[PDB]
Amino acid sequence: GPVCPFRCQCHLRVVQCSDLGLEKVPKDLPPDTALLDLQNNKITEIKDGDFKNLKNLHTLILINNKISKISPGAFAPLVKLERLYLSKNQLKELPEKMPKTLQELRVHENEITKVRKSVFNGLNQMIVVELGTNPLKSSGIENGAFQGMKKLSYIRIADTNITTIPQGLPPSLTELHLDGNKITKVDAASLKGLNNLAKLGLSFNSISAVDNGSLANTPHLRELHLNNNKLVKVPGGLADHKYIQVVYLHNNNISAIGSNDFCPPGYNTKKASYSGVSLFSNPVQYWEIQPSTFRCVYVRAAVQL
Amino acid sequence: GPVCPFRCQCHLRVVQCSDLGLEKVPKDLPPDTALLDLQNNKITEIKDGDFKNLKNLHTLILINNKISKISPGAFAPLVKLERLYLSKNQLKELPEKMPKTLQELRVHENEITKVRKSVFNGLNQMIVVELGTNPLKSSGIENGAFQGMKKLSYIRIADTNITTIPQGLPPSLTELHLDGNKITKVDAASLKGLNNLAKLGLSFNSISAVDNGSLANTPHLRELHLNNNKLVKVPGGLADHKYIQVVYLHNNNISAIGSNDFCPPGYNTKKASYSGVSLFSNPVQYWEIQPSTFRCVYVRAAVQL
Ligand SMILES: *[C@@H]1O[C@H](CO)[C@@H](O[C@@H]2O[C@H](CO)[C@@H](O)[C@H](O)[C@H]2NC(C)=O)[C@H](O)[C@H]1NC(C)=O
Ligand SMILES: *[C@@H]1O[C@H](CO)[C@@H](O[C@@H]2O[C@H](CO)[C@@H](O)[C@H](O)[C@H]2NC(C)=O)[C@H](O)[C@H]1NC(C)=O
Ligand SMILES: *[C@@H]1O[C@H](CO)[C@@H](O)[C@H](O)[C@H]1NC(C)=O
Ligand SMILES: *[C@@H]1O[C@H](CO)[C@@H](O)[C@H](O)[C@H]1NC(C)=O
Ligand SMILES: *[C@@H]1O[C@H](CO)[C@@H](O)[C@H](O)[C@H]1NC(C)=O
């Protein structure tokens, strides 16, 4: 029957095989296994029949191995897989034919250079994708690459080499994290249709300009992080926007702030109250800003200068 | 109201904060968090208040951070904690006052140089301990250090500088893994009392001698891995042992094999049948072994020369 690899721990539907220097995926594991942890081993590839009889596996952890090659439909048998963690490996591209039940994919710190729309089509359960720390470029991501995922709620591409915000992002998105890349500008086209986006993380990039109408394309944005960039003015549209509440702009090159940069002409009862605004580490000093500039901020501690 | 940290994903009692470069344990997390994943961040230390209100947390993952200091009882508030993974950090010692409910401790790949018995006193729920890849030396391990774990079933100390098998191991142990260290001899005193031991892993060490009566101290041993050592002869006591079934001796310096090395005088129906014996990559050649040497092995394929 089922065998437990020497040194591994097989207890209650869990197969713990971490830190053992394994050179390949062990076979003959208990059929009812629900979580297989192969973290920190020395696996180089996932052959076509590495996961047979693991119909009940919902979590697969392959973090910190040496995987550089994965056979198509290698995860085909994992008909109940919900989490696939492949972070800290040597993947050049994302694997094809991932279980349709997949809810989360993490490929942080690999060698991904290209992202095709083909790899994601059909994945209607995906809610979270993390692609940070990869030598990926904007040209490497196809327009509409994440389009095929009807339920995608969170996407994070951080510490890569992308220079623009990917185009054709799934409208179901509520959080878009692109911190620590090489983005130089925010264009309204890339944010078109993001009706449910609530959080936008663009900190630690090289953004110098934010096109007019960008923020309007994310009508319900609540949190906007643009700190540690190269802005020379507060992005436009904040005064008209009705849902924005947190705007971090510290560590930029803003030297002036108009009286209508955050708040509309007088008082708009329809515009939500700012709960946080950061402006420290910018050329502008508190003494160069009319007090009225923050009239629509009643919580004094909300602004940091 | 509980707050989910920016970029983290908080869903179904699970707080996912991996790969974010966090410099410290986030706070104000959902009181009902069952699992906290802070893997691959830049956390340098765990302060006394870091884990308050996490009374229902059963799993804490701090793997792959830069932790090099932990406050006593810092984990104390984690009264339901069952798993604590501290692997790939910079600990010099094990933490004190760990949740008495703890069933598994993993501290692989750290900088531990000393192991105090005081750390395990009271951990009566602890079933698995992993302390591999540490500069640890035999002098750094107190006698009966793991003595306090009345229920400990598995312990692995691999790839360290220990040269001898720790003394005063809990008799409840079913698995003892000491693969990849610098152990030179197997003394009977160390294995004394281990009546429940079923697996003994000593491969990849510097073992040249196995004291007589060693195996007799592990009467129910089923699997013995002694491959890749410096044995000159097959360890004694195998013929009188009744439970031993797997004996890996490949990759050693054994020059001869007597007729009573594995099998006893005739046929002891009370002795378990071998299912796996490896002797390849040894000075001895297959034609130098007398056929009757494996009389008590009926599944020919079991032996690998
Ligand atoms: C972003 O791209 C640059 C340039 O391709 C990467 O830096 C180079 O990395 C190569 C290895 O692939 C080195 O041999 C070169 O010396 C680097 N070039 C320069 C000009 O420094 C960089 O690693 C990429 N960033 C990420 C996060 O992948
Ligand atoms: C295998 O065992 C033999 C002993 O039969 C080892 O021989 C030793 O060799 C060294 C020189 O390298 C001598 O100084 C010792 O006196 C020898 N030992 C004995 C007991 O005579 C041999 O080195 C071993 N082979 C390996 C690869 O370790
Ligand atoms: C953006 O809005 C500001 C103020 O309404 C305006 O001065 C600027 O010209 C606008 N940008 C463009 C490209 O028209
Ligand atoms: C900030 O803007 C001013 C005026 O445009 C420019 O002189 C200065 O070099 C900028 N600072 C940085 C760090 O780019
Ligand atoms: C063992 O200690 C020595 C110093 O005595 C050191 O050079 C070596 O790296 C250590 N090995 C391990 C596995 O910790």
* Structure token digits, residue A150: 């009807």
Place of tokens 């050649």: B285
Return the CATH number of the domain spanning residue range A1-305.
3.80.10.10
**At A16, is the secondary structure helix, strand, or coil?**
strand
**At A247, is the secondary structure helix, strand, or coil?**
strand
Q: Which of B6, B16, B177 sits opposite A225 (nearest CB)?
A: B6
The CB-side HSE value for A190 (13 A sphere, CA atoms) comes to 18
Q: How many CB atoms neighbour CB B125 within 10 A?
A: 16
Does B64 touch chain A if contact means CB atoms closer than 8 Å?
A: yes
Q: Write phi, then psi, for A162 (nearest 5 degrees).
A: -65, 150
For residue B231, which of B267, B279, B198 has the smallest C-alpha distance?
Answer: B279
Q: How many Å apart are CA B144 and CA B189, to the nearest integer?
A: 13
Q: How many Å apart are CA A210 and CA A206, to the nearest integer?
A: 11
Q: How many Å apart are CA B205 and CA B229, to the nearest integer?
A: 5
Which ligand minimizes its atom distance to the CA of A214?
Answer: 3
- Assign 3-class secondary structure to chain B: CCCCCCCCEEECCEEECCCCCCCCCCCCCCCCCCEEECCCCCCCCECCCCCCCCCCCCEEECCCCCCCCECCCCCCCCCCCCEEECCCCCCCECCCCCCCCCCEEECCCCCCCEECHHHCCCCCCCCEEECCCCCCCHHHECCCCCCCCCCCCEEECCCCCCCCCCCCCCCCCCEEECCCCCCCEECHHHHCCCCCCCEEECCCCCCCEECCCCHHHCCCCCEEECCCCCCCCCCCCCCCCCCCCEEECCCCCCCCCCCCCCCCCCCCCCCCCCCEEECCCCCCCHHHCCHHHHCCCCCHHHEEC
Q: How many Å apart are CA A274 and CA B151, to the nearest integer?
A: 55
Q: How many Å apart are CA B220 and CA B248, to the nearest integer?
A: 17
**At A120, is the secondary structure helix, strand, or coil?**
coil
Distance from the alpha carbon of residue A253 to the mean position of ligand 4, in angstroms: 6
**At A167, is the secondary structure helix, strand, or coil?**
coil
Q: How many Å apart are CA B227 and CA B246, to the nearest integer?
A: 12
Measured CA to CA in angstroms, residue A90 lies from A117, A125, B182 at distances of 21, 26, 32
Q: Write phi, then psi, for A250 (nearest 5 degrees).
A: -65, 155
Contact A278/A254 with Cβ under 8 angstroms? no
Q: In ligand 5, which atom is closest to the CA atom of B182? A: 13
* Structure token digits, residue A58: 């919902």
Name the residue type at position B96. E
Q: Which of B16, B128, B223 sits opposite A9 (nearest CB)?
A: B128
Q: Decide whether any atom of ligand 3 lies within 6 Å of the A139 Cβ.
A: no
Counting other chains too, the contacts that B35-38 makes at CB distance below 8 Å and 24 or more residues apart are B35/B59, B35/B60, B35/B61, B36/B60, B36/B61, B37/B61, B38/B62, B38/B65
Nearest-CA distance A177 → chain B (Å) = 7
Hey, which of B208, B229, B253, B281 would you mutate to test ligand 2's pocket, going by the most ligand atoms within 8 Å of its Cβ? B253
Q: Which residues line ligand 4 (CB under 6 A)?
A: A 230, 232, 253
Bridge partners (DSSP) listed for residue A246: A223, A276
Contacts of B42 (CB under 8 A, 6+ apart): B21, B22, B23, B65, B66
Name the residue type at position A199. K
Contact A105/A98 with Cβ under 8 angstroms? yes
Contact A162/A182 with Cβ under 8 angstroms? yes
Q: How many Å apart are CA B104 and CA B83, to the nearest integer?
A: 5
Distance from the alpha carbon of residue B253 to the mean position of ligand 2, in angstroms: 9
Does A35 touch chain B if contact means CB atoms closer than 8 Å?
A: no
Longest Cα pair distance anywhere in chain A, in angstroms? 77
Contact B161/B135 with Cβ under 8 angstroms? yes
Nearest-CA distance A133 → chain B (Å) = 9
Q: How many Å apart are CA B108 and CA A115, to the nearest integer?
A: 34
Pick left, alpha or beta for residue B266 (phi over 0 → left; psi -120 to 50 → alpha; otherwise beta).
alpha
Solved with: X-ray
Name residues 137-156 of chain A within 8 A of B (Cβ). Answer: 154, 156
Burial code (b: 16+ CB inside 10 Å, e: under 16) for A255-289 equals eebeeebbbbeeeeeebeebeebbbeebebeeeeb
Bridge partners (DSSP) listed for residue B185: B209
Q: Write phi, then psi, for A19 (nearest 5 degrees).
A: 55, 35
Measured CA to CA in angstroms, residue A48 lies from A94, A122, B58 at distances of 16, 21, 35
Report the residue of chain B nearest A153, measured CA to CA.
B9
Contact A135/A157 with Cβ under 8 angstroms? no
Pick left, alpha or beta for residue A251 (phi over 0 → left; psi -120 to 50 → alpha; otherwise beta).
left
Q: Decide whether any atom of ligand 2 lies within 6 Å of the B233 Cβ.
A: no
Q: How many Å apart are CA A25 and CA B281, to the nearest integer?
A: 25
**At A118, is the secondary structure helix, strand, or coil?**
helix
| Burial of residue A154 (number of CB atoms within 10 Å: 0-12, 13-18, 19+) | buried
Q: How many Å apart are CA A286 and CA A29, to the nearest integer?
A: 64
Q: How many Å apart are CA B75 and CA B100, to the nearest integer?
A: 10
For residue A38, give the DSSP letter.
Answer: -
Contact A9 B154 (CB under 8 A): yes
Measured CA to CA in angstroms, residue A27 lies from A4, A17, A53 at distances of 9, 12, 9
Contact B251/B281 with Cβ under 8 angstroms? yes
Contact B263/B289 with Cβ under 8 angstroms? no
Bridge partners (DSSP) listed for residue A14: A11, A35
Q: In ligand 5, which atom is closest to the CA atom of B181? A: 13
For residue A112, which of A84, A88, A128 has the smallest C-alpha distance?
Answer: A88
Q: How many Å apart are CA A174 and CA A127, to the nearest integer?
A: 10
Q: How many Å apart are CA B129 and CA B140, to the nearest integer?
A: 17
Contact A115/A145 with Cβ under 8 angstroms? yes
Does B179 touch chain A if contact means CB atoms closer than 8 Å?
A: yes
* Structure token digits, residue B43: 């956390």
* Structure token digits, residue B269: 């129906």
Contact B102/B126 with Cβ under 8 angstroms? yes
